[PDB]
Amino acid sequence: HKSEVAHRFKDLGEENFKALVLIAFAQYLQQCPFEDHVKLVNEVTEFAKTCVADESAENCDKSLHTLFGDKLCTVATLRETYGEMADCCAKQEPERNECFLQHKDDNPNLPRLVRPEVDVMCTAFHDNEETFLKKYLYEIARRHPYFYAPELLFFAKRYKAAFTECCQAADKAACLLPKLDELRDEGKASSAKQRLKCASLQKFGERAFKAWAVARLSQRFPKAEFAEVSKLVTDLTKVHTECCHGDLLECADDRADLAKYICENQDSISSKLKECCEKPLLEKSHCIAEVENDEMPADLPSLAADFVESKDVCKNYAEAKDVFLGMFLYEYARRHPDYSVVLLLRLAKTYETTLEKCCAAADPHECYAKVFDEFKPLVEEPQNLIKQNCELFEQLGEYKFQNALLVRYTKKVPQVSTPTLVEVSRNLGKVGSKCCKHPEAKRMPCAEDYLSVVLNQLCVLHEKTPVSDRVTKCCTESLVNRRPCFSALEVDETYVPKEFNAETFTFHADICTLSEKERQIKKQTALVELVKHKPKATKEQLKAVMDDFAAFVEKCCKADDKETCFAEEGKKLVAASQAALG
Ligand SMILES: O=C(O)c1cc2c(c3c1c([N+](=O)[O-])cc1ccccc13)OCO2
Ligand SMILES: O=C(O)c1cc2c(c3c1c([N+](=O)[O-])cc1ccccc13)OCO2
Ligand SMILES: CCCCCCCCCCCCCC(=O)O
Ligand SMILES: CCCCCCCCCCCCCC(=O)O
Ligand SMILES: CCCCCCCCCCCCCC(=O)O
Ligand SMILES: CCCCCCCCCCCCCC(=O)O
Numbered sequence: 049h050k051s052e053v054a055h056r057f058k059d060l061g062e063e064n065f066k067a068l069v070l071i072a073f074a075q076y077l078q079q080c081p082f083e084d085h086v087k088l089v090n091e092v093t094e095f096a097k098t099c100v101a102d103e104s105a106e107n108c109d110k111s112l113h114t115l116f117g118d119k120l121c122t123v124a125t126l127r128e129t130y131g132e133m134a135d136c137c138a139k140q141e142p143e144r145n146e147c148f149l150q151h152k153d154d155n156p157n158l159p160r161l162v163r164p165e166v167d168v169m170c171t172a173f174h175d176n177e178e179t180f181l182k183k184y185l186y187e188i189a190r191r192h193p194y195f196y197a198p199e200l201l202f203f204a205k206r207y208k209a210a211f212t213e214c215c216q217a218a219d220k221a222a223c224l225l226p227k228l229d230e231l232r233d234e235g236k237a238s239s240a241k242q243r244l245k246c247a248s249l250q251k252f253g254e255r256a257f258k259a260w261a262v263a264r265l266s267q268r269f270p271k272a273e274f275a276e277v278s279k280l281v282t283d284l285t286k287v288h289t290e291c292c293h294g295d296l297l298e299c300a301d302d303r304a305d306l307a308k309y310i311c312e313n314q315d316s317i318s319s320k321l322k323e324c325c326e327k328p329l330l331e332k333s334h335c336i337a338e339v340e341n342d343e344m345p346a347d348l349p350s351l352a353a354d355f356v357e358s359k360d361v362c363k364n365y366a367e368a369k370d371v372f373l374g375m376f377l378y379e380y381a382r383r384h385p386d387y388s389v390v391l392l393l394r395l396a397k398t399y400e401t402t403l404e405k406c407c408a409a410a411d412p413h414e415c416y417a418k419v420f421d422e423f424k425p426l427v428e429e430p431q432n433l434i435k436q437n438c439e440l441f442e443q444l445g446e447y448k449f450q451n452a453l454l455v456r457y458t459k460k461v462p463q464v465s466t467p468t469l470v471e472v473s474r475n476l477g478k479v480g481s482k483c484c485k486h487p488e489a490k491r492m493p494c495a496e497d498y499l500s501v502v503l504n505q506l507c508v509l510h511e512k513t514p515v516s517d518r519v520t521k522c523c524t525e526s527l528v529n530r531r532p533c534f535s536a537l538e539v540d541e542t543y544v545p546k547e548f549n550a551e552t553f554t555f556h557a558d559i560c561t562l563s564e565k566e567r568q569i570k571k572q573t574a575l576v577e578l579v580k581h582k583p584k585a586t587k588e589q590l591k592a593v594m595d596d597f598a599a600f601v602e603k604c605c606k607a608d609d610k611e612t613c614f615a616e617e618g619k620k621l622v623a624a625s626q627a628a629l630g
């Protein structure tokens with residue numbers, strides 16, 4: 049178009065345009081105050097309106113990258129605040145934009161965002177809704193500078209809905225706080241999955257990513273032909289390749305192009321896309337990314353015909369090995385939306401290993417005739433793991449389920465920092481409560497998506513301050529093998545029990561007046577420390593100390609001299625436990 053800024057303004061609408069301009073500036077200029085950014089947005093928006101009124105007005109024909117770069121280089125504090133980044137202004141495009149991307153700071157060292165009191169938030173929301181929400185959008189964007197801006201805008205709108213509902217409700221905090229907890233977790237997860245996809249693309253390569261995409265789209269679009277799934281896989285891998293490079297505009301265009309193609313070819317792809325494809329440009333690709341699986345065709349044949357029984361297996365394989373393997377994955381994935389993607393990838397890797405070995409024998413058919421028997425234990429392992437864990441979760445409930453995992457995992461990797469052991473076990477308990485509520489058919493995909501997040505949260509923390517060779521091995525192995533590796537960890541036999549420390553197991557009256565969450569973490573922290581000191585304690589011995597501890601807290605909270613009860617009966621609890629263990 050003659051004026052790309054006018055085209056964006058008309059396509060997005062003013063409100064959306066202004067919010068995305070704020071995010072973009074915040075993600076590049078992560079240290080400038082909110083008020084500086086608001087002025088930039090207003091200036092850009094007033095310029096944009098000139099172009100909408102006259103596409104041939106001055107500078108309206110300039111590229112969005114040129115205009116955006118020119119505006120960054122007008123920031124007066126650019127060299128004093130960002131130093132080296134101000135030298136990108138001496139360059140011409142496209143080198144100037146590439147230079148700017150290189151100086152995005154993923155660890156900007158900003159203070160943690162403190163959640164205000166419910167009444168305080170609801171009052172700010174009423175008195176200045178836009179400043180309240182937009183400031184938070186700026187705070188989140190500068191802290192997550194690679195977070196795809198449209199999706200950040202989508203979260204902002206869900207927050208707005210939470211505040212308009214709950215701030216006019218009788219019990220505001222009971223309404224609002226769980227909504228903010230759930231939204232924060234979702235945003236954390238979404239951010240983590242974006243980073244995970246890019247990290248995996250670079251380490252393991254384009255081929256491995258295309259395999260993941262073949263499985264993902266085949267489950268989603270089971271009625272589409274292989275050739276159509278494979279075309280979509282190529283474009284999706286290009287979308288993620290570009291998007292991981294970090295250029296928002298290039299990422300947005302590539303995504304809009306794929307959404308446009310998908311929506312123009314619904315009849316060849318899926319019957320679930322009609323609603324997404326009626327949505328505005330801004331939301332189309334995100335809607336499609338989250339579309340529900342289409343219903344699979346009825347009476348699909350067994351895979352044994354084309355992949356086991358046919359005389360042409362090795363011939364078809366050797367002609368074009370990745371196309372044949374992609375076809376195997378497509379046929380398996382479309383039939384099993386109830387599998388994790390990595391499970392489907394394990395089956396493809398198993399089939400490939402068998403074909404490489406067998407097609408070289410004189411009688412390949414005999415060699416690979418039982419290959420579908422090798423899939424059975426691979427399928428059953430996560431299936432059984434899900435059944436066992438969900439049944440234990442129903443028996444124990446979320447808190448006690450977290451403590452079951454806390455003990456188990458402290459014993460396997462006692463060297464991990466106690467805060468990390470608590471957070472990971474807590475989050476894994478949340479995966480149980482979320483996914484176990486699903487029917488069996490959807491449990492394993494649910495578990496995979498949330499475990500990907502939790503386990504990479506563990507890996508990156510460990511990466512920063514490593515402690516255990518076994519955790520680094522599971523974190524650096526095949527992502528397809530990441531979950532089985534963590535599951536195969538055994539109790540650390542060579543761990544030297546940590547030395548007793550008195551104040552670690554000293555408790556005060558503050559525990560009674562703490563929030564339920566902080567009291568849970570306080571107790572979970574001490575349970576980890578208990579196992580790190582007595583790693584060989586049996587489950588009976590541990591339950592007894594936990595039962596003793598529970599009596600000690602409820603007796604000393606109702607005590608009228610609370611402080612001395614906690615000290616006196618605490619010395620008793622510790623001395624009794626030190627003899628009931630070891
Ligand atoms: O934990 C935070 O600091 C945090 C606090 C928050 C959030 C988010 C947060 C994060 N995070 O993990 O940084 C990611 C997010 C990703 C998308 C959307 C929102 C958030 O929106 C309101 O208060
Ligand atoms: O990668 C995925 O999980 C994903 C899965 C998908 C997709 C898309 C996906 C993504 N993504 O990045 O999420 C972006 C997209 C952008 C434009 C069009 C489609 C998609 O359409 C169906 O299955
Ligand atoms: C993309 C996010 C846009 C706005 C999100 C914040 C809206 C106000 C709620 C912030 C309160 C703190 C949230 C928290 O710490 O859990
Ligand atoms: C200088 C960049 C900010 C102004 C232009 C931002 C345009 C973002 C496009 C958002 C629409 C994406 C559509 C999609 O994801 O499919
Ligand atoms: C569209 C190309 C599909 C190619 C299929 C490759 C064969 C499937 C095996 C997948 C192995 C992935 C390696 C890994 O990440 O562990
Ligand atoms: C409490 C943990 C969540 C519920 C049980 C999950 C079962 C283990 C993982 C299942 C499969 C994950 C993806 C995979 O490895 O194939």
Ligand SMILES: CCCCCCCCCCCCCC(=O)O
Nearest residue numbers: 457461464468469472506534535
């Ligand atoms: C925090 C360091 C220890 C991390 C322990 C690995 C977590 C195991 C994930 C594998 C599936 C979890 C469900 C299960 O307990 O079987």
Ligand SMILES: CCCCCCCCCCCCCC(=O)O
Nearest residue numbers: 553571574575578594597622625
């Ligand atoms: C040497 C150990 C001294 C005794 C201290 C016991 C600390 C164990 C904390 C038990 C936490 C589990 C209780 C709960 O979650 O309700």
